[PDB]
Write a protein that binds this ligand. Structure first.
Ligand SMILES: CSC[C@H](NC(=O)[C@H](Cc1ccccc1)OC(=O)N1CCC(N)CC1)C(=O)N[C@@H](CC1CCCCC1)[C@@H](O)COc1ccncc1
Length: 330
């Protein structure tokens, strides 16, 4: 079997992407954020404290005939954002772009952080990291991908995120028309439960490629690109007026500036991120200072290849026995 769903930016900055997901019987369509950096499938629901809901579409288990309470099960999650959510657990039928999974753990939120309440376009998350990170207790649950794996034509899913445009999440097959040239595969470490890999180096603009090992994770659920202080400093040193601001918490640059591209290595291949992708607009309405899409990971503890990098490529997540990550230009 296979599945294919269109994913759409939530705003003109591509801060995040939402993908319609059908839950229950009859179907209840919610717009979820596909997150390869987490392993929980959670949604706003009829159980969420009324004051914490503001415009989101909610899942109503009582209206679904295939929903079943998972007695005693609970969940609690806190994101690198500081964001937090918690609640109880149901099992129900979930379909993504035609691909159906029965008995999928659907985590119903009772409490959500203000950050979530304020975000009316996101109805919940769909975790696509490894099941070892799932927070359901006392019985850990499997991810949607894990549950569909067997039925898939190939144990893979691909991410084709657009720049200021819709993209595609495919399950079970590789669209050979979606990319140019060849796909370069690279080893993945599952030790921490992430799609963790090692980049072979980088280049700024038309500069010399620097061969250096960069260990990080492929994370669709993170907007920006977080790299080591040394790499980030070398990038922004090429932008006049750019500086690290303590007040805004990161590198900012004069909106009138032209950003150089950034190249990251995948084995012997190279992926180029156009400079335009690295511009995240004014720090505040009317400001002439703009926010940079490449920031330091120093305080995070891990390098993150977020949307900024992923959207420059066609990305294959191969969930085979020996998982790999495939990168192609497009
Ligand atoms: C450096 S992890 C911070 C990161 N959250 C972001 O990237 C958010 C995403 C967002 C959400 C809602 C609207 C707009 C953007 O966006 C921004 O933080 N920014 C974009 C706007 C830019 N101008 C301001 C900075 C993060 O927790 N991701 C997790 C998923 C995320 C949680 C919040 C809801 C949406 C999904 C997740 O994958 C983290 O996995 C790991 C985290 C830490 N170790 C390893 C893996």
């Amino acid at each position: 079997s296979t599945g294919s769903a269109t994913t759409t930016p939530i705003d003109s900055l591509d801060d995040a992407y939402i993908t319609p997901v059908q839950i229950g019987t009859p179907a209840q369509t919610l717009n979820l954020d596909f997150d390869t950096g987490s392993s929980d499938l959670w949604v706003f629901s009829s159980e969420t404290t009324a004051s914490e809901v503001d415009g989101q579409t909610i899942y109503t288990p009582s209206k679904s005939t295939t929903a079943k309470l998972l007695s005693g099960a609970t969940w609690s999650i806190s994101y690198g954002d500081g964001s937090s959510s918690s609640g109880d657990v149901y099992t129900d039928t979930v379909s993504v772009g035609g691909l159906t999974v029965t008995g999928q753990a659907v985590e119903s939120a009772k409490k959500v952080s203000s950050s979530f309440t304020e975000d009316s376009t996101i109805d919940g998350l769909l975790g696509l990291a490894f099941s070892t990170l799932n927070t359901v207790s006392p019985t850990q649950q499997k991810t949607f991908f894990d549950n569909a794996k067997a039925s898939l034509d190939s144990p893979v899913f691909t991410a084709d995120l657009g720049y200021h445009a819709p993209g595609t999440y495919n399950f079970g097959f590789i669209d050979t028309t979606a990319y140019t040239g060849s796909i370069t595969y690279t080893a993945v470490s599952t030790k921490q439960g992430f799609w963790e890999w090692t980049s072979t180096g980088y280049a700024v603009g038309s500069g010399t490629f620097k061969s250096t090992s960069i260990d990080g994770i492929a994370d669709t659920g993170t907007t920006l690109l977080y790299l080591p202080a040394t790499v980030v400093s070398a990038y922004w040193a090429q932008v006049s007026g750019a500086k690290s601001s303590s007040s805004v918490g990161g590198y900012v640059f004069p909106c009138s500036a032209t950003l150089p591209s950034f190249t990251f290595g995948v084995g012997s291949a190279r992926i180029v991120i156009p400079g335009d992708y690295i511009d995240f607009g004014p720090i505040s309405t009317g400001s002439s200072s703009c926010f940079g899409g490449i920031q330091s990971s120093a305080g995070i503890g891990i390098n993150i290849f977020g949307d900024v990098a992923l959207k420059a490529a066609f990305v294959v997540f191969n969930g085979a026995t020996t998982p790999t990550l495939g990168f192609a230009s497009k």
